[PDB]
Design a protein around this ligand. Sequence first.
Ligand code: GTP
Ligand code: CL
Ligand code: CL
Ligand code: CL
Ligand code: CL
Ligand code: CL
Ligand code: CL
Ligand code: CL
Ligand code: MG
Ligand code: MG
Ligand code: MG
Ligand code: MG
Ligand code: NA
Ligand code: NA
Ligand code: NA
Ligand code: NA
Ligand code: NA
Ligand code: NA
Ligand code: NA
Ligand code: NA
Ligand code: NA
Ligand code: NA
Ligand code: NA
Ligand code: NA
Ligand code: NA
Lengths: 202, 164
Amino acid sequence: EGKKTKNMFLTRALEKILADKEVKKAHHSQLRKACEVALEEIKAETEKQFIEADKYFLPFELACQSKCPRIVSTSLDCLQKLIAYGHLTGNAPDSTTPGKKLIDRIIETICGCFQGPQTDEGVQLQIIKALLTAVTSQHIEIHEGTVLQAVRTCYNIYLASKNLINQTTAKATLTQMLNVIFARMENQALQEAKQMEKERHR
Amino acid sequence: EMRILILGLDGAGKTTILYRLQVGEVVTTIPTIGFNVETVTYKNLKFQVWDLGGLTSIRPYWRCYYSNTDAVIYVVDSCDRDRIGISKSELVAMLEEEELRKAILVVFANKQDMEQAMTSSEMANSLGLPALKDRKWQIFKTSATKGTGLDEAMEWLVETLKSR
Ligand SMILES: Nc1nc2c(ncn2[C@@H]2O[C@H](COP(=O)(O)OP(=O)(O)OP(=O)(O)O)[C@@H](O)[C@H]2O)c(=O)[nH]1
Ligand SMILES: [Cl-]
Ligand SMILES: [Cl-]
Ligand SMILES: [Cl-]
Ligand SMILES: [Cl-]
Ligand SMILES: [Cl-]
Ligand SMILES: [Cl-]
Ligand SMILES: [Cl-]
Ligand SMILES: [Mg+2]
Ligand SMILES: [Mg+2]
Ligand SMILES: [Mg+2]
Ligand SMILES: [Mg+2]
Ligand code: NA
Ligand code: NA
Ligand code: NA
Ligand code: NA
Ligand code: NA
Ligand code: NA
Ligand code: NA
Ligand code: NA
Ligand code: NA
Ligand code: NA
Ligand code: NA
Ligand code: NA
Ligand code: NA
């Protein structure tokens, strides 16, 4: 089953960004441009004919860097839906980056939306959700430095947050994230051992 | 302002219901792993609605989110005859939890749009809803793929929250 849903998320999120007030300003002009350019391509390719999300990360990274919680939340929610549905894999390494890939840069952008207690509470929540999804996603391979970063960010939110709902979520998210990571490590060890037993038989 | 959880076994239609309530569309979904959370507005109380995964391995995490929960929407596959005993088992477990003592229960017999579906009564039985006390609750036939049931169930729920 091949899906329209990827596209709806990408386009509707971009539209919501472009539709927001504070993005009209020249102060968010780069963001405005990025979103219009991305849209100009996704629309142009959707009437023709797969749409590859990896190429369109720039508007979301920029939205995340905005000084408007509204823009940031919208960006974070879209990224979580993108990663979750497996449209945003991020398996291409930038230049200085390796041994790291696009995905590590995406998780890092997510983590950087948290600036301490003063961070908007809805953006906090959005950060917890997206990290949980990222870290528990079976599609993507995440560098362990990026894993530890994800982990540290959730725990920081848990300490610093004034919002009890957010604290508890952070708490629950950490436990699940950790349990998943460890389950996954143990299973990888298992597969490696099995291959090795198989090779052992020349 | 009001905290709502959507719970139930995997495949039941929790996530589809979620986005059918938020933007009135049938979204294509994946098995939920990490929670979903959305702001929903039925005229006119503000809702924070949480959607957790119903896979076996995720269910123990449900209670981590019972804190301060105002109401629970519990979603059951009306065609899952094999597993309705498990929905009961889980529904029983969660309503034994002290953090949910004053939460409103709403059951969605989902996938009613299909012919193989069980009835409201048969399902309310198999989930042991009559033996519930002191619990405020009601069961509702629904299809999330179509529109049937959602508006009646939400209206009930909304009134019941006000009333309390
Ligand atoms: N026929 C019919 N199918 C439905 C209905 N609601 C959901 N489905 C389908 O059942 C499957 C499960 O939908 P989801 O909403 O993802 O189920 P879920 O409750 O979130 O399951 P988990 O995320 O694994 O916990 C999907 O393929 C839906 O298309 C319904 O009302 N009628
Ligand atoms: Cl998010
Ligand atoms: Cl920090
Ligand atoms: Cl705030
Ligand atoms: Cl753990
Ligand atoms: Cl070898
Ligand atoms: Cl605990
Ligand atoms: Cl009650
Ligand atoms: Mg089922
Ligand atoms: Mg789901
Ligand atoms: Mg779900
Ligand atoms: Mg409302
Ligand atoms: Na437009
Ligand atoms: Na445009
Ligand atoms: Na193409
Ligand atoms: Na949002
Ligand atoms: Na490795
Ligand atoms: Na909150
Ligand atoms: Na619509
Ligand atoms: Na509260
Ligand atoms: Na069945
Ligand atoms: Na009890
Ligand atoms: Na108490
Ligand atoms: Na009583
Ligand atoms: Na009605």
